[PDB]
Amino acid sequence: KEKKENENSWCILEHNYEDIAQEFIDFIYKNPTTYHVVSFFAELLDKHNFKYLSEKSNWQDSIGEDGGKFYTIRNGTNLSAFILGKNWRAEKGVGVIGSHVDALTVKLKPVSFKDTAEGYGRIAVAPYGGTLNELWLDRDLGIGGRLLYKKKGTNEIKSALVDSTPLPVCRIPSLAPHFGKPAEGPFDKEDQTIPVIGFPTPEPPTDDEKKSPLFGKHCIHLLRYVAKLAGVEVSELIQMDLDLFDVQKGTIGGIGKHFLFAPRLDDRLCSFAAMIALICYAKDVNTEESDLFSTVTLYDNEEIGSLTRQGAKGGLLESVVERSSSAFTKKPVDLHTVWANSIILSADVNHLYNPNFPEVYLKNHFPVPNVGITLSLDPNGHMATDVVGTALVEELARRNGDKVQYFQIKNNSRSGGTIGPSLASQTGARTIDLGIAQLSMHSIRAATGSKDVGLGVKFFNGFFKHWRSVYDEFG
Amino acid sequence: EEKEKKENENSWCILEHNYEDIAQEFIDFIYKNPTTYHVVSFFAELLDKHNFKYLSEKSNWQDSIGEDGGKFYTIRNGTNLSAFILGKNWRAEKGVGVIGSHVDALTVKLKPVSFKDTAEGYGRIAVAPYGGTLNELWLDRDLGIGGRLLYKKKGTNEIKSALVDSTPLPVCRIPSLAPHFGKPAEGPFDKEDQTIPVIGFPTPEPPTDDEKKSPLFGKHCIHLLRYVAKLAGVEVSELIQMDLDLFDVQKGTIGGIGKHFLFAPRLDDRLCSFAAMIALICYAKDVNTEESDLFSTVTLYDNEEIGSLTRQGAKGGLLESVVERSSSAFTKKPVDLHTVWANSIILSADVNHLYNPNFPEVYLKNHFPVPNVGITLSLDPNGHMATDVVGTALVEELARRNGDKVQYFQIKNNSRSGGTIGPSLASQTGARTIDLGIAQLSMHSIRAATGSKDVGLGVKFFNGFFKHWRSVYDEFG
Amino acid sequence: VNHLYNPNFPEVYLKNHFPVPNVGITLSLDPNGHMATDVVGTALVEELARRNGDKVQYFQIKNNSRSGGTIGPSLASQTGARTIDLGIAQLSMHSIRAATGSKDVGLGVKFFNGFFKHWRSVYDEFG
Ligand SMILES: C[As](C)(=O)[O-]
Ligand SMILES: C[As](C)(=O)[O-]
Ligand SMILES: C[As](C)(=O)[O-]
Ligand SMILES: C[As](C)(=O)[O-]
Ligand SMILES: C[As](C)(=O)[O-]
Ligand SMILES: [Zn+2]
Ligand SMILES: [Zn+2]
Ligand SMILES: [Zn+2]
Ligand SMILES: [Zn+2]
């Protein structure tokens, strides 16, 4: 009864879109940084019997003839989960959803220390992508991310995740418009959009605290705070990679509750939907009987162009498929044949029609809320989508009872790029760019349809179930 | 029971050095009372609980105030409130101790006709800015709806009003354009065509014959009228008119790594209004009006953000009216109001500007305040503030006596100043008027900041003002 | 090579994130992908330096400035391996005649020699 109720809410089997929307909101709120997001999905995969495999060891002794359910992680921010059926062969190919788990944020600088300014404590930070604009002003900002530490009297460097939520430790204060021209944006990202962390009154550093490699690089108040959050000493902190982020919890909104308002939708929205879809699909997959290879791979650094080891161009997908297939058959695998028979969904959020800016949306080529997944189409290589991929997705949706929408830019407009073209050329596999549409992409707080999380999960679940069968129609 | 009563006084009136509780009450106050109508209603109910008697403006007060004086208040337009305490031994020569503040805040109003046609299925509402809103700070914020409905129950000729509030439901949002689209996504944005709140995306009941009998049918979307009617507990047909705000529903919070800050919407000037009213109530607890020789008031105005020239603003004269009517009813003999006002002190209590360390070039050295220190005097030699040398000296003397700290704000010579009600009240009364307030960051933002101790420190200062202004002003004679 | 502080152009250098002459190797840090350096790489080099007796400096651009890109991101992407962008800092990069510290060549050799001797042992502490 409880297991049947959980399957209905998570996998939208009983037509319940409210619960999955709430779980997405909870997920975003409880996992503010990329590190937290990858850790969330790792814990989720563990609970559904996926086995963690380390990149640093050869997989031949871990994967055998029976295949199974597995995942791996690179850099703590790039994760690939996969299901390998016992009866898989090269000609079956791979069914891939590729998304990104990085989101626009603000990073503490390597030295965050700033002199007090008339008593005000501030921290030196840097934008990750196009942040530190007017939308980041006057927002409640928490602090969180990865601390590296070394326990006193040991040599090993370990990792801890920290999160100030619900405490907003800082805020970037707008200047009152009373002052005139100085209060008009845009504002200088180095000199003007600086987080204000406190205003301390009249303990100084102890001799132990000074033994920290981070002493002098960050304010002692800050060091003590993150040390307390992680349950370690200040002296033990060696380094850190911390974000500032909006601590305003997401919510269902609109007068008819048609919307979901939440931070960091790009692209944790599709990443969540694809991952939940994989878990739902995996519940009814017996890997002893399956002839398929399925994966969701989640990348870092897409917002800065994907050219890092943990981004799409770093090749985790390709490595996973090569290592899995070599261990699985213990014999030479034709990876060119594998990728020639594969489909990659490059699942990245696209743009909902904004009725206040009709002039930038292409007629007949914009999505609306609460309908279904949106294909991203572009004739100049910004998206990897082609005629066969469009037809495949439309065929798949007709079979599974999903609706499909279009996005394409106006000829006089401008397009962003996704990981899709990178994945397509790296593998040689047909790649389809699509995703869950949203308003206000790259704002500190964005919006999508309240049913779109659930509709997304339904479509991706349908993909894993039927992509192979549908693609065989084209052969 | 008795210990809880002592602990309650200690929290609200900061008698045990407890600044955290009063900071939370302020946050709760802002969150639960999003519109000017709610704020005045909150204070009206607070005043009732501490034995202030409501007096209608519409009737003469000669029968309601007698020789013993007492604790009273009145309301104009539901948005302009004056509470006062009149002593049995008050005379014209004692004057009046006034704190004047404003309860209006920058907001977004629904237009008289909010109805917009659906735009590719999107529901939107037609709105207008109240003061300098509908800018980039208003984009991508969770907006609730609330304010005053006017209604007429079926089978009656009584027009009555109800306050409504969607909180916690954000019914709409003003969506920014993604920067991917380029130049169209760069601000500033047109306040009529571009910053329009998106309220829904409905899917496929039509209006009934009874709903069509509403005066507001056709003026607002049927979904909206249904919603506000359900909140008010009335029928759509009964709705006569409405005056509704859009506002940030994000609840305020204590913040900063050492909890030195308070982040909240609509601080200008509900921050000083709250602190002054609580100070009045705290002071009032230990005042026997049968023995007191004082006349004390907090008067809260509307429309200060639009220049105060309305009947419910400072230029409408509620203060002057209250003092004239009360004193006439009190003595039942000729009161010389010119002597009254010549012996009075008016604190024009309005928030001023905390030093912002990221814009040092706009703050005057030695003339800016910092958080968690105390009240800030607003000084200006060109008439933007009413503060003069004697008023500065009075406040500094008051503070030294009561153990408060005082800060300064004045603009740089190459900068520009806001204007408060202070000059208006000074001119209208002829009384010495002192502009001061609790300083804040990001005034006119949708979400501002002040110090976490500053609510309590304001209450403390204003309480000392009521206790000691008369004695201190007597030093200057 | 990365950029030594030029005292005639203070306005383009980020406080606490510039190197000076004759101290040691300089880490190139950038949160927008111009360099491959990450938090673990930073900690590795600092650990390695502490063990070998080398000094480490930082370079990162101001938020309102501009960055060059190195081969680092390419090598990290092509291999999948953790990559650390660093170098010996110089003045007047891309001039026909540039400048560095007179000790910096030797200090560079000493640091790189320490890397080959000890990188495996130090990186094992992160495992
Ligand atoms: C004119 As400015 C740099 O204060 O936005
Ligand atoms: C670089 As993108 C398509 O995630 O805005
Ligand atoms: C460039 As515009 C008028 O869309 O802010
Ligand atoms: C017009 As004002 C002094 O309340 O910003
Ligand atoms: C392209 As370069 C970092 O060698 O100046
Ligand atoms: Zn993006
Ligand atoms: Zn994206
Ligand atoms: Zn104002
Ligand atoms: Zn004001």
The DSSP annotation for B275-334 comes to HHHHHHHHHHHT--TTT---EEEEEEES-TTTTS-STTSGGG-HHHHHHHHHHHHHHSS-
Residue A136 near residue B179 (C-beta atoms within 8 A): no
Measured CA to CA, the distance from residue B36 to residue A359 in angstroms comes to: 37
Residue A232's Cβ-side half-sphere holds a number of Cα atoms within 13 Å equal to: 23
Which tokens belong to A285? 């997959």
**Structure letter (DSSP) for residue B238:** G
Q: Give the DSSP H or E segment for C79.
A: helix C72-79
Measured CA to CA, the distance from residue B469 to residue B398 in angstroms comes to: 7
**Structure letter (DSSP) for residue B69:** -
Measured CA to CA, the distance from residue A38 to residue A40 in angstroms comes to: 5
Q: Is C96 an interface residue toward A (CB < 8 Å)?
A: no
- Which of C85, C72, C25, C18 minimizes the C-alpha distance to C50? C25
Phi, psi of B209 (to 5 degrees): -60, -35
Extended strands (E) in B44-94: 53-54, 70-76, 80-86
Q: Is C80 in contact with A314 (Cβ distance < 8 A)?
A: yes
| Residue in A122, A167, A354 nearest the CB of B177 | A354
Distances (CA, A) of B175 to A369, A374, B24, B178, B185: 14, 20, 31, 9, 11
Ligand 2, atom 4, lies closest to the CA of A303
Q: Which residues line ligand 1 (CB under 6 A)?
A: A 182, 184-188
Q: B and C: touch, per 3+ CB pairs < 8 A?
A: no
Give the environment of ion ligand 7: residues with CB less than 5 A.
A 266-267, 348
Which tokens belong to A345? 């969904």
Q: Is A148 in contact with C29 (Cβ distance < 8 A)?
A: no
Residue B157 near residue A390 (C-beta atoms within 8 A): no
Ligand 4, atom 1, lies closest to the CA of B305
Q: Is A118 an interface residue toward B (CB < 8 Å)?
A: yes
Residue B64 amino acid letter: S
Where is the binding site for substrate, in residues of B? 180, 304, 350, 353
Q: Is C126 an interface residue toward A (CB < 8 Å)?
A: yes
Tell me which residue has tokens 């560095």. Answer: C100
Closest chain B C-alpha to A319 CA, distance in angstroms: 32
Beta bridge partners of A467: none
Residue C69 near residue C30 (C-beta atoms within 8 A): no
A-B CB pairs within 8 A amount to 249
Ligand 1 atom nearest the C-alpha of A183 is 4
Q: Give chain A's domains with CATH numbers.
A: 1-103+249-475 (3.40.630.10), 104-248 (2.30.250.10)
**Shortest CA distance from A183: residue in chain B:** B359
Measured CA to CA, the distance from residue A339 to residue B61 in angstroms comes to: 90
Residue B209 amino acid letter: D
At C16, is the secondary structure helix, strand, or coil? Answer: coil
Residue B340 near residue B355 (C-beta atoms within 8 A): no
Backbone breaks in chain B after residues (C–N over 2.5 Å): 204
At B335, is the secondary structure helix, strand, or coil? Answer: coil
B435 CB within 6 A, ligand 4: no
Write C102-107 long-range contacts (CB < 8 A, 24+): C102/C21, C102/C22, C103/C21, C103/C22, C104/C21, C104/C22, C107/C22, C107/C23, C107/C24, C107/C25, C107/C54
B302 CB within 6 A, ligand 4: no
Measured CA to CA, the distance from residue A220 to residue A243 in angstroms comes to: 18
Distances (CA, A) of A121 to A114, B255, B263, C64: 7, 13, 16, 21
Q: Give the DSSP H or E segment for B6.
A: helix B2-12
Ligand 1 atom nearest the C-alpha of B359 is 4
Residue A144 near residue A165 (C-beta atoms within 8 A): yes
Q: Is A309 in contact with C80 (Cβ distance < 8 A)?
A: yes
Interface test with C, best of A155, A217, A226, A239 (most C CBs within 10 A): A239
Q: Give the DSSP H or E segment for B349.
A: strand B345-349
Measured CA to CA, the distance from residue B384 to residue B419 in angstroms comes to: 5
Q: Which residues contact A193 (CB under 8 A, 6 or more apart)?
A: A132, A133, A136, A137, A172, A187, B358, C63
Ligand 3, atom 3, lies closest to the CA of B189
Residue B458 near residue B402 (C-beta atoms within 8 A): no
DSSP track, C80-109: ------EE-EEBSTTSSS-B--TTHHHHHH
Cα A380 to averaged position of ligand 2 atoms, centre (Å):
16
Measured CA to CA, the distance from residue A104 to residue A132 in angstroms comes to: 10
Cα A133 to averaged position of ligand 8 atoms, centre (Å):
23
- Which of A377, A361, A346 minimizes the C-alpha distance to A267? A346
Distances (CA, A) of B283 to A60, B279, B465: 80, 6, 10
Ligand 1, atom 3, lies closest to the CA of A187
At B467, is the secondary structure helix, strand, or coil? Answer: helix
Measured CA to CA, the distance from residue B20 to residue B259 in angstroms comes to: 10
Cα A362 to averaged position of ligand 7 atoms, centre (Å):
19
Tell me which residue has tokens 């997001």. Answer: A37
* CA dihedral angle for residue C3, residue C7, residue C11, residue C13, rounded to 10 degrees: 30
Which tokens belong to B158? 């009584």
Measured CA to CA, the distance from residue A102 to residue A266 in angstroms comes to: 8
**Which ligand is closest in space to the CA of residue A358?**
3
Beta bridge partners of A79: A73, A298
- Which of B80, B132, B145 minimizes the C-alpha distance to B306? B132
Chain-centroid distance, C-alpha B326: 24
**Structure letter (DSSP) for residue B358:** T
Number of C-beta neighbours around residue B365 at 10 A = 8
Q: Is A142 an interface residue toward B (CB < 8 Å)?
A: no
- Which of A94, A468, A434, A437 minimizes the C-alpha distance to A296? A94
Ligand 3, atom 1, lies closest to the CA of B184
Ligand 5 atom nearest the C-alpha of C94 is 5
Q: Is A360 an interface residue toward B (CB < 8 Å)?
A: yes
Q: Which residues contact A129 (CB under 8 A, 6 or more apart)?
A: A104, A105, A303, A304, A442, C32
Residue C6 amino acid letter: N
Q: Is C77 in contact with A148 (Cβ distance < 8 A)?
A: no
Closest chain C C-alpha to A91 CA, distance in angstroms: 27
Which tokens belong to B56? 């209608």
Q: A-contacting residues of B 192-251, CB under 8 Å?
A: 193-196, 198-203, 223-224, 227, 250
Measured CA to CA, the distance from residue B320 to residue B271 in angstroms comes to: 24
Chains in touch with B (3+ beta-carbon pairs under 8 Å) read A
A-C CB pairs within 8 A amount to 100
At B56, is the secondary structure helix, strand, or coil? Answer: coil
Measured CA to CA, the distance from residue A224 to residue A233 in angstroms comes to: 8
DSSP track, B379-441: --TTSSS---HHHHHHHHHHHHHHT--EEEE---TTS-----SHHHHHHHH--EEEEEE-EEB
Number of C-beta neighbours around residue A62 at 10 A = 16
Measured CA to CA, the distance from residue B90 to residue B329 in angstroms comes to: 13
**Structure letter (DSSP) for residue B185:** G
Which tokens belong to B339? 């002597």
Beta bridge partners of A461: none
Measured CA to CA, the distance from residue A384 to residue A406 in angstroms comes to: 14
Q: Which residues contact B450 (CB under 8 A, 6 or more apart)?
A: B261, B262, B267, B271, B351, B354, B371, B438, B439, B440, B441
- Which of A93, A305, B9, A62 minimizes the C-alpha distance to C74? A305
Residue B474 amino acid letter: D
Measured CA to CA, the distance from residue C111 to residue C127 in angstroms comes to: 23
| Residue in A143, A251, A413 nearest the CB of B170 | A251
DSSP track, B250-269: ---EEESTTS-EEEES-HHH
Burial of A354 (0-12, 13-18, 19+ CB in 10 A): buried
Residue C2 near residue C89 (C-beta atoms within 8 A): yes
Which strand ranges, in their side-by-side order, compose the sheet holding A78-84? A51-52, A68-74, A78-84, A293-299, A95-100, A343-347, A430-435, A373-376, A404-407
Measured CA to CA, the distance from residue A260 to residue A210 in angstroms comes to: 46
At C115, is the secondary structure helix, strand, or coil? Answer: helix
Measured CA to CA, the distance from residue C80 to residue C75 in angstroms comes to: 8
Q: Is B38 an interface residue toward A (CB < 8 Å)?
A: no
Measured CA to CA, the distance from residue A53 to residue A63 in angstroms comes to: 9
Measured CA to CA, the distance from residue B438 to residue B364 in angstroms comes to: 18
Q: Which residues contact B403 (CB under 8 A, 6 or more apart)?
A: none
Burial of B154 (0-12, 13-18, 19+ CB in 10 A): exposed
Phi, psi of C7 (to 5 degrees): -65, -15
Q: Which residues contact B427 (CB under 8 A, 6 or more apart)?
A: none
| Residue in B171, B179, B353 nearest the CB of A255 | B171
Residue B179's Cβ-side half-sphere holds a number of Cα atoms within 13 Å equal to: 13
Measured CA to CA, the distance from residue C52 to residue C117 in angstroms comes to: 9
3-state secondary structure chain A: CHHHHHHHHHHCCCCCHHHHHHHHHHHHHHCCCHHHHHHHHHHHHHHCCCEECCCCCCCCCCCCCCCEEEEEEECCCEEEEEEECCCCCHHHCCEEEEEECCCCEEEECCCCCCCCECCEEECCEEEECCCCCHHHCCCCEEEEEEEEECCCCCCCCEEEEEECCCCCCEECCCCCHHHCHHHCCCCCCCCCCCCEEECCCCCCCCHHHHCCCCECCECHHHHHHHHHHHCCCHHHEEEEEEEEEECCCCEEECCCCCEEEECCHHHHHHHHHHHHHHHHHHHCCCCCCCCCEEEEEEECCHHHCCCCCCCHHHCHHHHHHHHHHHHHHCCCCCHHHHHHCCEEEEECCEECCCCCCHHHCCCCCCCCCCCCEEEECCCCCCCCCCHHHHHHHHHHHHHHCCCEEEECCCCCCCCCCCCHHHHHHHHCCEEEEEECEEECCCCCCEEEECCHHHHHHHHHHHHHHHHHHHHHHHC
Cis geometry, peptide bond prior to residue B423 (ω within 30 degrees of 0): no
Residue B105 near residue A101 (C-beta atoms within 8 A): no
Number of C-beta neighbours around residue A273 at 10 A = 29
Interface test with A, best of C57, C63, C79 (most A CBs within 10 A): C63
- Which of A263, A417, A434, A447 minimizes the C-alpha distance to A355? A447
Which tokens belong to A292? 């398929």
B418 CB within 6 A, ligand 4: yes
Ligand 2 atom nearest the C-alpha of B180 is 5
**Shortest CA distance from B201: residue in chain A:** A258
Beta bridge partners of A297: A80, A98
Phi, psi of C56 (to 5 degrees): -120, 140
Residue B412 near residue B363 (C-beta atoms within 8 A): yes
At B346, is the secondary structure helix, strand, or coil? Answer: strand
A102 CB within 6 A, ligand 2: no
Which tokens belong to B85? 């305490």
Quick one: chain C helix, strand, coil %, rounded to 5?
35, 15, 50
Q: Is the dihedral of CA B37, B38, B42, B43 positive or negative?
A: negative
β-strand pairing of C25-28 with C86-87: antiparallel
**Shortest CA distance from A301: residue in chain C:** C33
Q: Is A122 an interface residue toward C (CB < 8 Å)?
A: no
Which tokens belong to A180? 């005139």
Burial of A285 (0-12, 13-18, 19+ CB in 10 A): middle
At B378, is the secondary structure helix, strand, or coil? Answer: strand
Q: Is A52 an interface residue toward B (CB < 8 Å)?
A: no
Q: Which residues contact A150 (CB under 8 A, 6 or more apart)?
A: A156, A157, A158, A236, A238, C125
Ligand 2 atom nearest the C-alpha of A267 is 4
Which tokens belong to A456? 């997304």
Interface test with A, best of C11, C14, C30, C32 (most A CBs within 10 A): C32
| Residue in B195, B353, B451 nearest the CB of A176 | B353
Residue A445 near residue A264 (C-beta atoms within 8 A): no
Q: Give chain C's end-to-end CA distance (angstroms, integer).
A: 30
Burial of B139 (0-12, 13-18, 19+ CB in 10 A): buried
Final resolution, Å: 2.1
At B16, is the secondary structure helix, strand, or coil? Answer: coil
- Which of A364, A419, A464, A443 minimizes the C-alpha distance to B138? A443
- Which of A36, A31, A83 minimizes the C-alpha distance to A297? A83
* CA dihedral angle for residue B418, residue B424, residue B427, residue B432, rounded to 10 degrees: -70
Q: Is C124 an interface residue toward A (CB < 8 Å)?
A: no
Cα A266 to averaged position of ligand 6 atoms, centre (Å):
5
Residue C38 near residue C70 (C-beta atoms within 8 A): no
**Which ligand is closest in space to the CA of residue B417?**
4
Ligand 5 atom nearest the C-alpha of C93 is 5
At C111, is the secondary structure helix, strand, or coil? Answer: helix
Residue A165 amino acid letter: T
